[PDB]
Design an enzyme around this catalytic site. Structure first.
Site, PDB file in Angstrom:
ATOM      1  N   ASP A  37       0.809  -1.231   0.000  1.00 35.08           N
ATOM      2  CA  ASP A  37       0.000   0.000   0.000  1.00 35.08           C
ATOM      3  C   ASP A  37       0.839   1.276   0.000  1.00 35.08           C
ATOM      4  O   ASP A  37       1.338   1.731   1.051  1.00 35.08           O
ATOM      5  CB  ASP A  37      -0.881  -0.034   1.269  1.00 35.08           C
ATOM      6  CG  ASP A  37      -1.825   1.179   1.380  1.00 35.08           C
ATOM      7  OD1 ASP A  37      -2.064   1.888   0.404  1.00 35.08           O
ATOM      8  OD2 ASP A  37      -2.428   1.355   2.467  1.00 35.08           O
ATOM      9  N   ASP A 222      -1.602   5.538  -5.308  1.00 34.99           N
ATOM     10  CA  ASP A 222      -2.080   4.700  -4.141  1.00 34.99           C
ATOM     11  C   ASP A 222      -2.400   3.262  -4.564  1.00 34.99           C
ATOM     12  O   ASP A 222      -3.512   3.014  -5.028  1.00 34.99           O
ATOM     13  CB  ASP A 222      -3.347   5.323  -3.562  1.00 34.99           C
ATOM     14  CG  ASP A 222      -3.760   4.650  -2.271  1.00 34.99           C
ATOM     15  OD1 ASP A 222      -3.087   3.690  -1.907  1.00 34.99           O
ATOM     16  OD2 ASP A 222      -4.784   5.025  -1.720  1.00 34.99           O
TER      17      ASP A 222
HETATM   18  C1  LIG Z   1      -4.997   2.090   4.922  1.00 32.35           C
HETATM   19  C2  LIG Z   1      -5.815   1.990   3.649  1.00 32.35           C
HETATM   20  C3  LIG Z   1      -6.345   0.545   3.438  1.00 32.35           C
HETATM   21  C4  LIG Z   1      -6.366   0.025   2.156  1.00 32.35           C
HETATM   22  C5  LIG Z   1      -6.876  -1.246   1.883  1.00 32.35           C
HETATM   23  N1  LIG Z   1      -6.829  -1.674   0.545  1.00 32.35           N
HETATM   24  C6  LIG Z   1      -7.574  -2.642  -0.029  1.00 32.35           C
HETATM   25  O1  LIG Z   1      -8.294  -3.393   0.608  1.00 32.35           O
HETATM   26  C7  LIG Z   1      -7.396  -2.837  -1.460  1.00 32.35           C
HETATM   27  C8  LIG Z   1      -8.350  -3.527  -2.193  1.00 32.35           C
HETATM   28  C9  LIG Z   1      -8.193  -3.653  -3.564  1.00 32.35           C
HETATM   29  C10 LIG Z   1      -7.064  -3.000  -4.164  1.00 32.35           C
HETATM   30  C11 LIG Z   1      -6.847  -3.100  -5.571  1.00 32.35           C
HETATM   31  N2  LIG Z   1      -6.685  -3.173  -6.680  1.00 32.35           N
HETATM   32  C12 LIG Z   1      -6.167  -2.298  -3.351  1.00 32.35           C
HETATM   33  N3  LIG Z   1      -6.344  -2.256  -2.041  1.00 32.35           N
HETATM   34  C13 LIG Z   1      -7.457  -2.027   2.909  1.00 32.35           C
HETATM   35  C14 LIG Z   1      -7.500  -1.486   4.228  1.00 32.35           C
HETATM   36  C15 LIG Z   1      -6.972  -0.195   4.492  1.00 32.35           C
HETATM   37  F1  LIG Z   1      -7.021   0.330   5.771  1.00 32.35           F
HETATM   38  N4  LIG Z   1      -4.939   2.353   2.529  1.00 32.35           N
HETATM   39  C16 LIG Z   1      -5.269   3.212   1.576  1.00 32.35           C
HETATM   40  N5  LIG Z   1      -4.388   3.396   0.503  1.00 32.35           N
HETATM   41  O2  LIG Z   1      -6.382   3.930   1.587  1.00 32.35           O
HETATM   42  C17 LIG Z   1      -7.503   3.352   2.265  1.00 32.35           C
HETATM   43  C18 LIG Z   1      -7.068   3.005   3.683  1.00 32.35           C
HETATM   44  F2  LIG Z   1      -8.075   2.402   4.229  1.00 32.35           F
END
Ligand SMILES: C[C@]1(c2cc(NC(=O)c3ccc(C#N)cn3)ccc2F)N=C(N)OC[C@H]1F
Ligand code: NA
Ligand code: NA
Length: 379
Positions: A37, A222
């Site tokens: 992330d 992101d």
């Molecule tokens: C910390 C945080 C986060 C991301 C994801 N991410 C996902 O679950 C996910 C799901 C699908 C994709 C794709 N493609 C990417 N990521 C899951 C929990 C999270 F707590 N990180 C970001 N960047 O912003 C949202 C924020 F909540």
């Protein structure tokens, strides 16, 4: 430099659930799958038997775990997690051959954070200390990695969309993962990987908004967000222009708002009626920009788990934002993305793995002449 065969294909994922890397924590090493992330800055792992988790960090089994005696409560718009801070030895098995002592938040309580059915059990926040919780004195993982070893201060991501897969090259770039040239855009400030978008076109037709609206209140790259999110005003203009471009078919209004899916008969998706989307980014040189262009293959996401339907269903994955532009997986799956922290710049090149068709491909093109690009940043 330029060839990291042991790290290629070290990402896996399932559509909708993001891209993860294997890591190990503690002594003896405990193996965990960790979501990659670039939109956050904590390394936080499940550490208690939540029902959605395949495995979790068992601190009592680690001889090298050191408790920092400090808790952290971290709410997001949707999720929250709360955990206990400590440090321990961490490695990336398909990564550089090194072991570092990193901060780890052991998550002991969470809500809407883990995904039921996903194969990862923690998150690896790769952005900067400025947005670490609880504050910037909690050193992020990549900072520790570069401090403690000889790994160069850069990493690169090739996210290959739809099982999904990809590569995270830690400490360098692998030239097999992209075609043509890298073009770089400056990191405006080191907190998120914040960039500046200076022009937006839909099928080559400029939206002609004041470019500050493209970055209101910031624009970021992101990997922990699926969609291309756009500031509401910009979303409104973008959608209107995309509707107009694709208007050879009519879809319910709800489709464009992501409130419903659209389905076609298998193998017949009309990709050609949908426009390409181009973001021009601030370049390296005064008055110089470049453009990245993605296809409907990136922004129409396949939805598999549709028990209501026989067909191929898709979600529109450009959405309105209140947090600025978010170039999530919709943008990143078109490109190989180089987070060149050492030079505070982000490079883009056409990804060798991106999904396209016989008529159109994702593109990274330059240079263009764009004046007053410094006005595009919101203060
Ligand atoms: C910390 C945080 C986060 C991301 C994801 N991410 C996902 O679950 C996910 C799901 C699908 C994709 C794709 N493609 C990417 N990521 C899951 C929990 C999270 F707590 N990180 C970001 N960047 O912003 C949202 C924020 F909540
Ligand atoms: Na170093
Ligand atoms: Na190449």
């Amino acid at each position: 430099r330029g060839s990291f065969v042991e790290m290629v294909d070290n990402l896996r994922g399932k559509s909708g659930q993001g891209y993860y890397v294997e890591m190990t924590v503690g002594s003896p090493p405990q193996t965990l799958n960790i979501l990659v992330d670039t939109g956050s800055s904590n390394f936080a792992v499940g550490a208690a038997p939540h029902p959605f988790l395949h495995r979790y960090y068992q601190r009592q089994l680690s001889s090298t775990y050191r408790d920092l005696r400090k808790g952290v409560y971290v709410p997001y718009t949707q999720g929250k997690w709360e955990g206990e801070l400590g440090t321990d030895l961490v490695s990336i098995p398909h990564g550089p051959n090194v072991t570092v002592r990193a901060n780890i938040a052991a998550i002991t309580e969470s809500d809407k954070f883990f995904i039921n059915g996903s194969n990862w059990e923690g998150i690896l926040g790769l952005a900067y200390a400025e947005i670490a919780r609880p504050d910037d004195s909690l050193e992020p993982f990549f900072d520790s990695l570069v401090k403690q070893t000889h790994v160069p201060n850069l990493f690169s991501l090739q996210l290959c969309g739809a099982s999904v897969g990809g590569s995270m090259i830690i400490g360098g770039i692998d030239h097999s993962l992209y075609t043509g040239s890298l073009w770089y855009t400056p990191i405006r400030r080191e907190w998120y990987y914040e960039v500046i978008i200076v022009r937006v076109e839909i099928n080559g037709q400029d939206l002609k908004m004041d470019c500050k609206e493209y970055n209101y209140d910031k624009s970021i790259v992101d990997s922990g967000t699926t969609n291309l999110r756009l500031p509401k005003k910009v979303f409104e203009a973008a959608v209107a222009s995309i509707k107009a471009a694709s208007s050879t078919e009519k879809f319910p209004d709800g489709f464009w708002l992501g409130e419903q899916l659209v389905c076609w008969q298998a193998g017949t998706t009309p990709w050609n009626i949908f426009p390409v989307i181009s973001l021009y980014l601030m370049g390296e040189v005064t008055n110089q920009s470049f453009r990245i262009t993605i296809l409907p293959q990136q922004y129409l996401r396949p939805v598999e788990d549709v028990a209501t339907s026989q067909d191929d269903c898709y979600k529109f994955a450009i959405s309105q934002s209140s947090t600025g532009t978010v170039m999530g997986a919709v943008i990143m799956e078109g490109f190989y993305v180089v987070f060149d922290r050492a030079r505070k710049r982000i490079g883009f090149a056409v990804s060798a793995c991106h999904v396209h068709d016989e008529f159109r491909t994702a593109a990274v093109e330059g240079p263009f002449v764009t004046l007053d690009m410094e006005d595009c940043g919101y203060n």
